Ligand binder design. Sequence first.
Ligand code: A1IQB
Ligand code: A1IQB
Lengths: 261, 264
Amino acid sequence: HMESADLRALAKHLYDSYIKSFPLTKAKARAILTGKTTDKSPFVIYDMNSLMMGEDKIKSKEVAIRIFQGCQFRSVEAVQEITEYAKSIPGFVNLDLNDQVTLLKYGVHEIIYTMLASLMNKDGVLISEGQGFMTREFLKSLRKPFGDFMEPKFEFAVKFNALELDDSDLAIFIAVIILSGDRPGLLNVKPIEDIQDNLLQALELQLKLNHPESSQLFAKLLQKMTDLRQIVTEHVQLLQVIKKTETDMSLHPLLQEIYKD
Amino acid sequence: HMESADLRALAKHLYDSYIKSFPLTKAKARAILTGKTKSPFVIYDMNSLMMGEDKIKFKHITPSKEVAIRIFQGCQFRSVEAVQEITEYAKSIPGFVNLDLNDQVTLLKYGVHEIIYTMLASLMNKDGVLISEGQGFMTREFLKSLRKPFGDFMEPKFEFAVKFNALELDDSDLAIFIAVIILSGDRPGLLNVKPIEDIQDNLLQALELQLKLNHPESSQLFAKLLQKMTDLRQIVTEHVQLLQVIKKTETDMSLHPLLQEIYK
Ligand SMILES: O=C(O)c1ccc(-c2nn(C(=O)c3ccccc3C(F)(F)F)c3ccc(Cl)cc23)c(OCc2ccccc2)c1
Ligand SMILES: O=C(O)c1ccc(-c2nn(C(=O)c3ccccc3C(F)(F)F)c3ccc(Cl)cc23)c(OCc2ccccc2)c1
Protein backbone atom coordinates (compact mmCIF):
# COMPACT_ATOMS: atom_id res chain seq x y z
CA HIS A 1 0.00 0.00 0.00
CA MET A 2 1.31 3.43 -1.10
CA GLU A 3 0.20 6.95 -0.18
CA SER A 4 -1.77 8.97 -2.72
CA ALA A 5 0.98 11.53 -3.34
CA ASP A 6 3.48 8.68 -3.78
CA LEU A 7 1.31 7.10 -6.48
CA ARG A 8 1.08 10.40 -8.37
CA ALA A 9 4.86 10.71 -8.09
CA LEU A 10 5.31 7.27 -9.64
CA ALA A 11 2.92 8.14 -12.50
CA LYS A 12 4.84 11.33 -13.32
CA HIS A 13 8.17 9.49 -13.15
CA LEU A 14 6.97 6.86 -15.60
CA TYR A 15 5.40 9.37 -18.02
CA ASP A 16 8.65 11.40 -18.04
CA SER A 17 10.71 8.28 -18.90
CA TYR A 18 8.21 7.19 -21.53
CA ILE A 19 8.66 10.56 -23.27
CA LYS A 20 12.42 10.17 -23.09
CA SER A 21 12.35 6.58 -24.37
CA PHE A 22 9.76 6.60 -27.21
CA PRO A 23 10.27 9.18 -29.98
CA LEU A 24 6.79 8.95 -31.53
CA THR A 25 4.11 9.37 -28.86
CA LYS A 26 0.37 8.75 -29.21
CA ALA A 27 -0.19 12.51 -28.90
CA LYS A 28 2.10 13.15 -31.88
CA ALA A 29 0.68 10.24 -33.90
CA ARG A 30 -2.91 11.47 -33.40
CA ALA A 31 -1.98 15.01 -34.48
CA ILE A 32 -0.51 13.54 -37.68
CA LEU A 33 -3.50 11.23 -38.23
CA THR A 34 -6.16 13.87 -37.61
CA GLY A 35 -4.53 16.36 -39.93
CA LYS A 36 -5.57 19.99 -40.36
CA THR A 37 -1.83 20.72 -40.31
CA THR A 38 0.22 21.44 -43.44
CA ASP A 39 3.59 20.64 -41.83
CA LYS A 40 2.90 17.15 -40.40
CA SER A 41 1.03 15.58 -43.38
CA PRO A 42 2.25 12.05 -44.30
CA PHE A 43 2.83 10.56 -47.72
CA VAL A 44 0.20 7.85 -48.20
CA ILE A 45 1.13 4.38 -49.51
CA TYR A 46 -1.85 2.47 -50.88
CA ASP A 47 -0.45 0.42 -53.80
CA MET A 48 2.68 -0.59 -55.71
CA ASN A 49 3.43 2.71 -57.43
CA SER A 50 2.89 4.84 -54.33
CA LEU A 51 5.19 2.44 -52.48
CA MET A 52 7.76 3.03 -55.23
CA MET A 53 7.26 6.80 -54.96
CA GLY A 54 7.60 6.50 -51.18
CA GLU A 55 11.25 5.39 -51.17
CA ASP A 56 12.14 8.55 -53.10
CA LYS A 57 10.19 10.91 -50.81
CA ILE A 58 10.30 9.46 -47.29
CA LYS A 59 13.69 7.73 -47.71
CA SER A 60 15.89 -5.94 -55.26
CA LYS A 61 13.30 -8.24 -53.69
CA GLU A 62 9.54 -8.94 -53.63
CA VAL A 63 7.01 -6.46 -52.24
CA ALA A 64 5.58 -8.53 -49.38
CA ILE A 65 9.09 -9.48 -48.26
CA ARG A 66 10.31 -5.88 -48.44
CA ILE A 67 7.38 -4.70 -46.33
CA PHE A 68 7.80 -7.61 -43.90
CA GLN A 69 11.50 -6.82 -43.44
CA GLY A 70 10.43 -3.22 -42.84
CA CYS A 71 8.26 -4.37 -39.92
CA GLN A 72 10.97 -6.50 -38.32
CA PHE A 73 13.51 -3.68 -38.62
CA ARG A 74 11.12 -1.42 -36.74
CA SER A 75 10.24 -4.17 -34.24
CA VAL A 76 13.92 -4.49 -33.34
CA GLU A 77 14.07 -0.73 -32.82
CA ALA A 78 10.98 -1.00 -30.62
CA VAL A 79 12.62 -3.73 -28.51
CA GLN A 80 15.54 -1.35 -27.94
CA GLU A 81 13.23 1.49 -26.88
CA ILE A 82 11.21 -0.78 -24.60
CA THR A 83 14.40 -2.12 -22.98
CA GLU A 84 15.54 1.42 -22.26
CA TYR A 85 12.17 2.26 -20.70
CA ALA A 86 12.11 -0.84 -18.47
CA LYS A 87 15.45 0.09 -16.89
CA SER A 88 13.70 3.24 -15.63
CA ILE A 89 10.92 1.31 -13.88
CA PRO A 90 11.77 1.52 -10.14
CA GLY A 91 13.10 -1.84 -8.97
CA PHE A 92 13.49 -3.41 -12.39
CA VAL A 93 17.29 -3.20 -12.58
CA ASN A 94 17.54 -4.41 -8.95
CA LEU A 95 15.91 -7.75 -9.84
CA ASP A 96 17.81 -10.95 -10.56
CA LEU A 97 19.52 -10.58 -13.93
CA ASN A 98 18.01 -13.72 -15.43
CA ASP A 99 14.53 -12.47 -14.50
CA GLN A 100 15.15 -9.11 -16.18
CA VAL A 101 15.91 -11.07 -19.35
CA THR A 102 12.85 -13.24 -18.82
CA LEU A 103 10.49 -10.29 -18.24
CA LEU A 104 11.67 -8.59 -21.44
CA LYS A 105 11.59 -11.83 -23.48
CA TYR A 106 7.86 -12.33 -22.92
CA GLY A 107 6.90 -8.69 -22.45
CA VAL A 108 8.18 -6.92 -25.55
CA HIS A 109 5.59 -8.33 -27.98
CA GLU A 110 2.59 -7.45 -25.82
CA ILE A 111 4.00 -3.92 -25.56
CA ILE A 112 4.76 -3.59 -29.26
CA TYR A 113 1.16 -4.43 -30.17
CA THR A 114 -0.11 -2.02 -27.49
CA MET A 115 1.94 0.88 -28.75
CA LEU A 116 1.32 -0.01 -32.39
CA ALA A 117 -2.35 0.79 -31.77
CA SER A 118 -1.27 4.39 -31.06
CA LEU A 119 -0.08 4.61 -34.69
CA MET A 120 -3.26 3.10 -36.13
CA ASN A 121 -6.77 4.09 -37.07
CA LYS A 122 -9.35 2.03 -38.96
CA ASP A 123 -7.73 2.92 -42.32
CA GLY A 124 -3.98 2.32 -41.85
CA VAL A 125 -0.77 2.75 -39.85
CA LEU A 126 1.90 5.46 -39.54
CA ILE A 127 5.43 4.47 -40.58
CA SER A 128 8.90 6.00 -40.79
CA GLU A 129 8.46 8.09 -37.63
CA GLY A 130 5.12 9.43 -38.89
CA GLN A 131 6.34 10.62 -42.30
CA GLY A 132 4.43 7.80 -43.99
CA PHE A 133 1.01 6.15 -43.76
CA MET A 134 0.41 2.69 -45.20
CA THR A 135 -3.25 1.77 -45.72
CA ARG A 136 -4.90 -1.24 -44.09
CA GLU A 137 -6.30 -2.24 -47.49
CA PHE A 138 -2.85 -2.42 -49.06
CA LEU A 139 -1.48 -4.53 -46.20
CA LYS A 140 -4.52 -6.82 -46.25
CA SER A 141 -3.98 -7.56 -49.98
CA LEU A 142 -0.36 -8.80 -49.75
CA ARG A 143 0.14 -12.35 -51.07
CA LYS A 144 0.82 -15.72 -49.41
CA PRO A 145 0.51 -15.62 -45.61
CA PHE A 146 1.55 -11.94 -45.36
CA GLY A 147 -1.86 -10.39 -46.09
CA ASP A 148 -3.53 -12.11 -43.14
CA PHE A 149 -0.43 -11.38 -41.06
CA MET A 150 -1.17 -7.63 -40.91
CA GLU A 151 -4.93 -7.52 -40.31
CA PRO A 152 -5.31 -8.86 -36.70
CA LYS A 153 -3.13 -5.99 -35.46
CA PHE A 154 -5.70 -3.58 -36.91
CA GLU A 155 -8.61 -5.48 -35.35
CA PHE A 156 -7.07 -5.21 -31.89
CA ALA A 157 -6.05 -1.57 -32.36
CA VAL A 158 -9.57 -0.41 -33.24
CA LYS A 159 -10.88 -2.04 -30.08
CA PHE A 160 -7.96 -0.90 -27.91
CA ASN A 161 -8.22 2.68 -29.19
CA ALA A 162 -11.88 2.80 -28.22
CA LEU A 163 -10.59 3.11 -24.63
CA GLU A 164 -9.13 6.54 -25.52
CA LEU A 165 -5.99 6.22 -23.38
CA ASP A 166 -3.32 8.89 -23.58
CA ASP A 167 0.45 8.55 -23.20
CA SER A 168 0.48 9.11 -19.44
CA ASP A 169 -2.00 6.24 -19.07
CA LEU A 170 0.00 4.00 -21.44
CA ALA A 171 3.25 4.63 -19.57
CA ILE A 172 1.88 2.96 -16.45
CA PHE A 173 0.07 0.22 -18.39
CA ILE A 174 3.27 -0.72 -20.26
CA ALA A 175 5.10 -0.94 -16.92
CA VAL A 176 2.41 -3.25 -15.51
CA ILE A 177 2.87 -5.60 -18.48
CA ILE A 178 6.66 -5.81 -18.11
CA LEU A 179 6.44 -6.68 -14.39
CA SER A 180 4.25 -9.79 -14.82
CA GLY A 181 5.10 -12.42 -12.26
CA ASP A 182 3.50 -15.25 -14.26
CA ARG A 183 6.14 -15.35 -16.97
CA PRO A 184 7.59 -18.86 -17.41
CA GLY A 185 10.95 -19.56 -15.77
CA LEU A 186 11.05 -16.63 -13.33
CA LEU A 187 13.24 -17.34 -10.32
CA ASN A 188 11.87 -14.83 -7.73
CA VAL A 189 8.20 -14.12 -8.35
CA LYS A 190 7.64 -12.17 -5.11
CA PRO A 191 9.83 -9.10 -5.78
CA ILE A 192 8.28 -8.82 -9.27
CA GLU A 193 4.73 -8.99 -7.91
CA ASP A 194 5.46 -6.37 -5.22
CA ILE A 195 6.53 -3.96 -7.96
CA GLN A 196 3.47 -4.74 -10.09
CA ASP A 197 1.19 -4.12 -7.09
CA ASN A 198 2.62 -0.61 -6.83
CA LEU A 199 2.25 -0.08 -10.58
CA LEU A 200 -1.31 -1.43 -10.50
CA GLN A 201 -2.17 0.99 -7.68
CA ALA A 202 -0.61 3.79 -9.69
CA LEU A 203 -2.54 2.81 -12.82
CA GLU A 204 -5.80 2.59 -10.88
CA LEU A 205 -5.41 6.08 -9.44
CA GLN A 206 -4.21 7.49 -12.79
CA LEU A 207 -7.25 6.20 -14.66
CA LYS A 208 -9.74 7.47 -12.06
CA LEU A 209 -8.23 10.97 -12.05
CA ASN A 210 -7.68 11.26 -15.80
CA HIS A 211 -10.92 9.55 -16.97
CA PRO A 212 -13.34 10.11 -14.07
CA GLU A 213 -16.44 9.62 -16.24
CA SER A 214 -15.09 6.35 -17.72
CA SER A 215 -16.61 3.73 -15.39
CA GLN A 216 -14.48 0.64 -14.63
CA LEU A 217 -11.85 1.71 -17.15
CA PHE A 218 -9.26 0.04 -14.92
CA ALA A 219 -10.98 -3.35 -15.13
CA LYS A 220 -11.65 -2.94 -18.87
CA LEU A 221 -8.01 -2.11 -19.57
CA LEU A 222 -6.85 -5.21 -17.65
CA GLN A 223 -9.28 -7.29 -19.67
CA LYS A 224 -7.42 -6.11 -22.80
CA MET A 225 -4.30 -7.99 -21.65
CA THR A 226 -6.28 -11.08 -22.67
CA ASP A 227 -6.64 -9.83 -26.26
CA LEU A 228 -2.87 -9.14 -26.20
CA ARG A 229 -1.93 -12.63 -25.01
CA GLN A 230 -3.96 -14.12 -27.90
CA ILE A 231 -2.50 -11.98 -30.69
CA VAL A 232 1.06 -12.74 -29.60
CA THR A 233 0.19 -16.44 -29.91
CA GLU A 234 -1.26 -15.96 -33.40
CA HIS A 235 1.80 -13.94 -34.36
CA VAL A 236 4.24 -16.63 -33.18
CA GLN A 237 2.34 -19.30 -35.12
CA LEU A 238 2.45 -17.18 -38.27
CA LEU A 239 6.17 -16.53 -37.99
CA GLN A 240 6.78 -20.27 -37.65
CA VAL A 241 4.95 -20.96 -40.93
CA ILE A 242 6.95 -18.24 -42.71
CA LYS A 243 10.23 -19.68 -41.40
CA LYS A 244 9.36 -23.11 -42.86
CA THR A 245 8.33 -21.56 -46.21
CA GLU A 246 10.56 -18.52 -46.76
CA THR A 247 14.01 -20.03 -46.31
CA ASP A 248 15.21 -16.86 -47.88
CA MET A 249 14.72 -14.44 -44.99
CA SER A 250 16.68 -14.18 -41.76
CA LEU A 251 15.58 -12.61 -38.50
CA HIS A 252 17.56 -10.07 -36.52
CA PRO A 253 19.61 -11.88 -33.83
CA LEU A 254 17.66 -10.01 -31.14
CA LEU A 255 14.33 -11.23 -32.52
CA GLN A 256 15.66 -14.78 -32.96
CA GLU A 257 16.48 -14.98 -29.26
CA ILE A 258 13.09 -13.67 -28.14
CA TYR A 259 11.35 -16.41 -30.12
CA LYS A 260 13.59 -19.29 -28.99
CA ASP A 261 11.06 -20.97 -26.69
CA HIS B 1 -22.86 5.24 -10.31
CA MET B 2 -24.18 2.61 -7.86
CA GLU B 3 -24.54 3.24 -4.13
CA SER B 4 -22.54 1.16 -1.67
CA ALA B 5 -25.66 -0.40 -0.14
CA ASP B 6 -26.91 -1.44 -3.59
CA LEU B 7 -23.66 -3.26 -4.34
CA ARG B 8 -23.83 -5.24 -1.09
CA ALA B 9 -27.44 -6.06 -1.96
CA LEU B 10 -26.33 -7.37 -5.34
CA ALA B 11 -23.50 -9.37 -3.75
CA LYS B 12 -25.95 -10.86 -1.25
CA HIS B 13 -28.43 -11.65 -4.02
CA LEU B 14 -25.84 -13.51 -6.08
CA TYR B 15 -24.44 -15.44 -3.09
CA ASP B 16 -27.89 -16.76 -2.13
CA SER B 17 -28.63 -17.91 -5.68
CA TYR B 18 -25.16 -19.45 -6.04
CA ILE B 19 -25.87 -21.60 -2.95
CA LYS B 20 -29.18 -22.78 -4.43
CA SER B 21 -27.70 -23.53 -7.86
CA PHE B 22 -24.54 -25.43 -7.03
CA PRO B 23 -24.89 -28.49 -4.78
CA LEU B 24 -21.26 -28.76 -3.60
CA THR B 25 -19.94 -25.38 -2.47
CA LYS B 26 -16.30 -24.43 -1.98
CA ALA B 27 -16.87 -24.19 1.79
CA LYS B 28 -18.20 -27.75 1.83
CA ALA B 29 -15.51 -29.06 -0.53
CA ARG B 30 -12.71 -27.60 1.63
CA ALA B 31 -14.09 -29.36 4.72
CA ILE B 32 -13.81 -32.67 2.87
CA LEU B 33 -10.35 -32.04 1.41
CA THR B 34 -8.78 -30.89 4.69
CA GLY B 35 -10.18 -33.69 6.84
CA LYS B 36 -12.23 -31.37 9.08
CA THR B 37 -15.44 -33.45 9.09
CA LYS B 38 -17.76 -39.65 6.48
CA SER B 39 -14.46 -39.79 4.61
CA PRO B 40 -14.79 -39.79 0.81
CA PHE B 41 -13.92 -42.97 -1.03
CA VAL B 42 -10.42 -42.60 -2.48
CA ILE B 43 -9.54 -43.67 -6.02
CA TYR B 44 -5.77 -43.99 -6.36
CA ASP B 45 -5.31 -46.88 -8.84
CA MET B 46 -7.12 -49.39 -11.05
CA ASN B 47 -8.38 -51.73 -8.29
CA SER B 48 -9.75 -48.95 -6.08
CA LEU B 49 -11.52 -47.57 -9.17
CA MET B 50 -13.23 -50.95 -9.62
CA MET B 51 -14.34 -51.00 -6.00
CA GLY B 52 -15.64 -47.41 -6.22
CA GLU B 53 -17.99 -48.07 -9.09
CA ASP B 54 -19.12 -51.32 -7.38
CA LYS B 55 -19.85 -49.72 -3.99
CA ILE B 56 -20.80 -46.08 -4.64
CA LYS B 57 -21.76 -46.52 -8.34
CA PHE B 58 -20.51 -43.22 -9.72
CA LYS B 59 -23.05 -42.19 -12.35
CA HIS B 60 -20.41 -41.20 -14.93
CA ILE B 61 -18.92 -44.73 -15.24
CA THR B 62 -21.28 -47.17 -17.02
CA PRO B 63 -21.99 -48.41 -20.55
CA SER B 64 -15.80 -48.58 -24.24
CA LYS B 65 -14.02 -50.92 -21.85
CA GLU B 66 -10.66 -49.15 -21.48
CA VAL B 67 -10.31 -47.32 -18.17
CA ALA B 68 -8.72 -44.06 -19.35
CA ILE B 69 -11.47 -43.50 -21.93
CA ARG B 70 -14.19 -44.21 -19.37
CA ILE B 71 -12.69 -41.62 -17.00
CA PHE B 72 -12.33 -39.09 -19.82
CA GLN B 73 -15.97 -39.54 -20.82
CA GLY B 74 -16.94 -39.23 -17.15
CA CYS B 75 -15.44 -35.74 -17.12
CA GLN B 76 -17.55 -34.78 -20.14
CA PHE B 77 -20.69 -36.20 -18.56
CA ARG B 78 -20.18 -34.14 -15.41
CA SER B 79 -19.43 -31.05 -17.51
CA VAL B 80 -22.82 -31.29 -19.19
CA GLU B 81 -24.42 -31.51 -15.74
CA ALA B 82 -22.57 -28.36 -14.66
CA VAL B 83 -23.77 -26.48 -17.76
CA GLN B 84 -27.38 -26.81 -16.59
CA GLU B 85 -26.45 -25.62 -13.10
CA ILE B 86 -24.65 -22.57 -14.53
CA THR B 87 -27.61 -21.88 -16.86
CA GLU B 88 -29.94 -21.83 -13.87
CA TYR B 89 -27.62 -19.54 -11.89
CA ALA B 90 -27.33 -17.11 -14.82
CA LYS B 91 -31.11 -16.56 -14.72
CA SER B 92 -30.72 -14.96 -11.28
CA ILE B 93 -28.23 -12.29 -12.43
CA PRO B 94 -30.22 -9.00 -12.49
CA GLY B 95 -30.89 -8.03 -16.10
CA PHE B 96 -29.84 -11.32 -17.70
CA VAL B 97 -33.31 -12.67 -18.58
CA ASN B 98 -34.24 -9.27 -20.04
CA LEU B 99 -31.49 -9.61 -22.64
CA ASP B 100 -32.21 -10.68 -26.20
CA LEU B 101 -32.81 -14.43 -26.17
CA ASN B 102 -30.09 -15.17 -28.77
CA ASP B 103 -27.59 -13.12 -26.74
CA GLN B 104 -28.45 -15.11 -23.61
CA VAL B 105 -27.68 -18.32 -25.52
CA THR B 106 -24.44 -16.88 -26.92
CA LEU B 107 -23.21 -15.71 -23.51
CA LEU B 108 -23.82 -19.15 -22.01
CA LYS B 109 -22.34 -21.03 -24.98
CA TYR B 110 -18.97 -19.23 -24.76
CA GLY B 111 -18.89 -18.74 -21.01
CA VAL B 112 -19.62 -22.19 -19.54
CA HIS B 113 -16.11 -23.51 -20.24
CA GLU B 114 -14.44 -20.69 -18.29
CA ILE B 115 -16.85 -21.15 -15.39
CA ILE B 116 -16.44 -24.94 -15.31
CA TYR B 117 -12.67 -24.59 -14.96
CA THR B 118 -13.12 -21.84 -12.37
CA MET B 119 -15.44 -23.93 -10.24
CA LEU B 120 -13.44 -27.12 -10.75
CA ALA B 121 -10.66 -25.46 -8.73
CA SER B 122 -13.00 -25.35 -5.73
CA LEU B 123 -13.02 -29.17 -5.77
CA MET B 124 -9.26 -29.58 -6.21
CA ASN B 125 -6.09 -29.50 -4.18
CA LYS B 126 -2.51 -30.33 -5.10
CA ASP B 127 -3.25 -34.05 -4.54
CA GLY B 128 -6.59 -34.76 -6.27
CA VAL B 129 -10.20 -33.85 -7.04
CA LEU B 130 -13.59 -34.50 -5.44
CA ILE B 131 -16.23 -36.29 -7.52
CA SER B 132 -19.86 -37.39 -7.06
CA GLU B 133 -20.84 -34.41 -4.93
CA GLY B 134 -17.87 -35.02 -2.67
CA GLN B 135 -18.41 -38.72 -2.00
CA GLY B 136 -15.29 -39.61 -3.97
CA PHE B 137 -11.72 -38.35 -4.29
CA MET B 138 -9.63 -39.16 -7.36
CA THR B 139 -5.91 -38.65 -6.87
CA ARG B 140 -3.88 -36.38 -9.12
CA GLU B 141 -1.23 -39.07 -9.54
CA PHE B 142 -3.74 -41.60 -10.81
CA LEU B 143 -5.21 -39.07 -13.29
CA LYS B 144 -1.77 -37.86 -14.40
CA SER B 145 -0.62 -41.43 -15.06
CA LEU B 146 -3.37 -42.31 -17.52
CA ARG B 147 -2.04 -43.52 -20.86
CA LYS B 148 -1.58 -41.86 -24.32
CA PRO B 149 -3.01 -38.26 -24.32
CA PHE B 150 -5.40 -38.76 -21.42
CA GLY B 151 -2.77 -38.35 -18.68
CA ASP B 152 -1.59 -35.03 -20.09
CA PHE B 153 -5.21 -33.96 -20.53
CA MET B 154 -5.92 -33.96 -16.77
CA GLU B 155 -2.80 -32.34 -15.31
CA PRO B 156 -3.17 -28.76 -16.71
CA LYS B 157 -6.43 -28.47 -14.76
CA PHE B 158 -4.56 -29.18 -11.51
CA GLU B 159 -1.84 -26.69 -12.44
CA PHE B 160 -4.42 -23.95 -12.94
CA ALA B 161 -6.35 -24.87 -9.77
CA VAL B 162 -3.31 -24.72 -7.48
CA LYS B 163 -2.46 -21.23 -8.73
CA PHE B 164 -6.11 -20.11 -8.66
CA ASN B 165 -6.66 -21.44 -5.13
CA ALA B 166 -3.69 -19.39 -3.80
CA LEU B 167 -5.99 -16.38 -4.10
CA GLU B 168 -8.16 -17.92 -1.33
CA LEU B 169 -11.50 -16.74 -2.72
CA ASP B 170 -14.63 -17.90 -0.92
CA ASP B 171 -18.10 -18.62 -2.33
CA SER B 172 -19.37 -15.06 -1.84
CA ASP B 173 -16.35 -13.87 -3.87
CA LEU B 174 -16.86 -16.56 -6.52
CA ALA B 175 -20.59 -15.88 -7.02
CA ILE B 176 -19.86 -12.36 -8.33
CA PHE B 177 -16.78 -13.44 -10.29
CA ILE B 178 -18.76 -16.14 -12.15
CA ALA B 179 -21.40 -13.52 -12.97
CA VAL B 180 -18.71 -11.21 -14.41
CA ILE B 181 -17.50 -13.98 -16.74
CA ILE B 182 -21.01 -14.64 -18.03
CA LEU B 183 -21.62 -10.98 -18.93
CA SER B 184 -18.68 -10.68 -21.34
CA GLY B 185 -19.49 -8.25 -24.09
CA ASP B 186 -16.81 -9.56 -26.44
CA ARG B 187 -18.43 -12.94 -27.20
CA PRO B 188 -18.70 -13.51 -30.98
CA GLY B 189 -22.10 -12.94 -32.54
CA LEU B 190 -23.66 -10.78 -29.82
CA LEU B 191 -26.51 -8.66 -31.14
CA ASN B 192 -26.83 -6.01 -28.39
CA VAL B 193 -23.55 -5.49 -26.51
CA LYS B 194 -24.51 -2.35 -24.60
CA PRO B 195 -26.85 -3.87 -21.93
CA ILE B 196 -24.39 -6.75 -21.41
CA GLU B 197 -21.54 -4.36 -20.63
CA ASP B 198 -23.88 -2.22 -18.53
CA ILE B 199 -24.59 -5.24 -16.34
CA GLN B 200 -20.94 -6.28 -16.26
CA ASP B 201 -20.01 -2.80 -15.02
CA ASN B 202 -22.40 -3.20 -12.08
CA LEU B 203 -21.03 -6.67 -11.30
CA LEU B 204 -17.42 -5.47 -11.54
CA GLN B 205 -18.29 -2.66 -9.09
CA ALA B 206 -19.83 -5.21 -6.76
CA LEU B 207 -16.85 -7.53 -7.09
CA GLU B 208 -14.39 -4.72 -6.30
CA LEU B 209 -16.23 -3.71 -3.12
CA GLN B 210 -16.75 -7.35 -2.10
CA LEU B 211 -13.01 -8.04 -2.32
CA LYS B 212 -11.99 -4.91 -0.39
CA LEU B 213 -14.40 -5.75 2.46
CA ASN B 214 -13.78 -9.51 2.52
CA HIS B 215 -9.99 -9.28 1.93
CA PRO B 216 -8.88 -5.85 3.19
CA GLU B 217 -5.27 -7.04 3.59
CA SER B 218 -5.00 -8.53 0.06
CA SER B 219 -3.58 -5.69 -2.01
CA GLN B 220 -4.89 -5.45 -5.59
CA LEU B 221 -6.76 -8.75 -5.31
CA PHE B 222 -9.32 -7.28 -7.73
CA ALA B 223 -6.61 -6.74 -10.35
CA LYS B 224 -5.14 -10.20 -9.77
CA LEU B 225 -8.48 -11.95 -10.14
CA LEU B 226 -9.09 -10.09 -13.42
CA GLN B 227 -5.68 -11.29 -14.58
CA LYS B 228 -6.86 -14.88 -14.01
CA MET B 229 -9.51 -14.26 -16.64
CA THR B 230 -6.51 -14.26 -18.98
CA ASP B 231 -5.39 -17.72 -17.87
CA LEU B 232 -8.93 -19.01 -18.26
CA ARG B 233 -9.25 -17.90 -21.87
CA GLN B 234 -5.89 -19.57 -22.51
CA ILE B 235 -6.75 -22.84 -20.78
CA VAL B 236 -10.10 -23.16 -22.61
CA THR B 237 -8.41 -22.82 -26.02
CA GLU B 238 -5.80 -25.40 -25.02
CA HIS B 239 -8.59 -27.73 -23.89
CA VAL B 240 -10.43 -27.48 -27.23
CA GLN B 241 -7.23 -28.21 -29.15
CA LEU B 242 -6.75 -31.31 -27.01
CA LEU B 243 -10.24 -32.69 -27.69
CA GLN B 244 -9.66 -32.32 -31.44
CA VAL B 245 -6.47 -34.40 -31.21
CA ILE B 246 -8.26 -37.19 -29.35
CA LYS B 247 -11.09 -37.25 -31.90
CA LYS B 248 -8.71 -37.54 -34.87
CA THR B 249 -6.60 -40.30 -33.27
CA GLU B 250 -8.78 -42.41 -30.93
CA THR B 251 -11.33 -44.66 -32.60
CA ASP B 252 -12.35 -46.45 -29.39
CA MET B 253 -14.32 -43.33 -28.32
CA SER B 254 -17.65 -43.75 -30.09
CA LEU B 255 -20.70 -43.83 -27.82
CA HIS B 256 -24.32 -44.48 -28.72
CA PRO B 257 -25.27 -41.72 -31.25
CA LEU B 258 -27.94 -40.40 -28.84
CA LEU B 259 -25.23 -40.04 -26.17
CA GLN B 260 -22.95 -38.38 -28.72
CA GLU B 261 -25.72 -35.84 -29.37
CA ILE B 262 -26.19 -35.14 -25.66
CA TYR B 263 -22.42 -34.53 -25.27
CA LYS B 264 -21.89 -32.60 -28.53
O1 A1IQB C 1 6.64 2.05 -35.20
C1 A1IQB C 1 6.50 1.09 -34.41
O2 A1IQB C 1 6.62 1.16 -33.15
C2 A1IQB C 1 6.15 -0.25 -35.01
C3 A1IQB C 1 6.10 -1.39 -34.23
C4 A1IQB C 1 5.77 -2.60 -34.79
C5 A1IQB C 1 5.50 -2.70 -36.16
C6 A1IQB C 1 5.10 -4.00 -36.73
N1 A1IQB C 1 5.72 -5.11 -36.38
N2 A1IQB C 1 5.09 -6.17 -37.02
C7 A1IQB C 1 5.56 -7.49 -36.86
O3 A1IQB C 1 5.21 -8.32 -37.66
C8 A1IQB C 1 6.45 -7.83 -35.71
C9 A1IQB C 1 6.04 -7.39 -34.45
C10 A1IQB C 1 6.80 -7.69 -33.33
C11 A1IQB C 1 7.95 -8.44 -33.45
C12 A1IQB C 1 8.35 -8.89 -34.68
C13 A1IQB C 1 7.62 -8.60 -35.83
C14 A1IQB C 1 8.11 -9.14 -37.15
F1 A1IQB C 1 9.41 -9.41 -37.15
F2 A1IQB C 1 7.53 -10.29 -37.48
F3 A1IQB C 1 7.91 -8.30 -38.16
C15 A1IQB C 1 4.03 -5.70 -37.79
C16 A1IQB C 1 3.09 -6.34 -38.60
C17 A1IQB C 1 2.12 -5.57 -39.21
C18 A1IQB C 1 2.12 -4.18 -39.03
CL1 A1IQB C 1 0.91 -3.21 -39.83
C19 A1IQB C 1 3.04 -3.54 -38.23
C20 A1IQB C 1 4.01 -4.31 -37.60
C21 A1IQB C 1 5.51 -1.54 -36.94
O4 A1IQB C 1 5.26 -1.66 -38.28
C22 A1IQB C 1 5.05 -0.47 -39.06
C23 A1IQB C 1 5.42 -0.74 -40.49
C24 A1IQB C 1 4.48 -1.17 -41.41
C25 A1IQB C 1 4.84 -1.42 -42.72
C26 A1IQB C 1 6.15 -1.24 -43.13
C27 A1IQB C 1 7.10 -0.81 -42.23
C28 A1IQB C 1 6.73 -0.57 -40.91
C29 A1IQB C 1 5.85 -0.32 -36.37
O1 A1IQB D 1 -17.97 -31.26 -10.44
C1 A1IQB D 1 -17.69 -30.36 -11.26
O2 A1IQB D 1 -18.10 -29.18 -11.17
C2 A1IQB D 1 -16.76 -30.73 -12.38
C3 A1IQB D 1 -16.52 -29.86 -13.44
C4 A1IQB D 1 -15.65 -30.21 -14.46
C5 A1IQB D 1 -15.01 -31.45 -14.45
C6 A1IQB D 1 -14.02 -31.77 -15.51
N1 A1IQB D 1 -14.31 -31.51 -16.78
N2 A1IQB D 1 -13.19 -31.85 -17.53
C7 A1IQB D 1 -13.11 -31.76 -18.94
O3 A1IQB D 1 -12.18 -32.31 -19.50
C8 A1IQB D 1 -14.15 -31.05 -19.74
C9 A1IQB D 1 -14.90 -31.82 -20.62
C10 A1IQB D 1 -15.89 -31.23 -21.39
C11 A1IQB D 1 -16.11 -29.87 -21.30
C12 A1IQB D 1 -15.36 -29.10 -20.43
C13 A1IQB D 1 -14.37 -29.67 -19.64
C14 A1IQB D 1 -13.57 -28.80 -18.71
F1 A1IQB D 1 -12.27 -28.79 -19.01
F2 A1IQB D 1 -13.97 -27.53 -18.72
F3 A1IQB D 1 -13.60 -29.19 -17.44
C15 A1IQB D 1 -12.16 -32.30 -16.71
C16 A1IQB D 1 -10.87 -32.75 -16.99
C17 A1IQB D 1 -10.07 -33.13 -15.94
C18 A1IQB D 1 -10.58 -33.10 -14.64
CL1 A1IQB D 1 -9.53 -33.64 -13.35
C19 A1IQB D 1 -11.86 -32.67 -14.34
C20 A1IQB D 1 -12.68 -32.26 -15.40
C21 A1IQB D 1 -15.24 -32.32 -13.37
O4 A1IQB D 1 -14.58 -33.51 -13.36
C22 A1IQB D 1 -14.67 -34.34 -12.19
C23 A1IQB D 1 -14.31 -35.72 -12.68
C24 A1IQB D 1 -13.01 -36.18 -12.59
C25 A1IQB D 1 -12.68 -37.44 -13.05
C26 A1IQB D 1 -13.65 -38.25 -13.60
C27 A1IQB D 1 -14.95 -37.80 -13.71
C28 A1IQB D 1 -15.28 -36.53 -13.25
C29 A1IQB D 1 -16.11 -31.96 -12.35
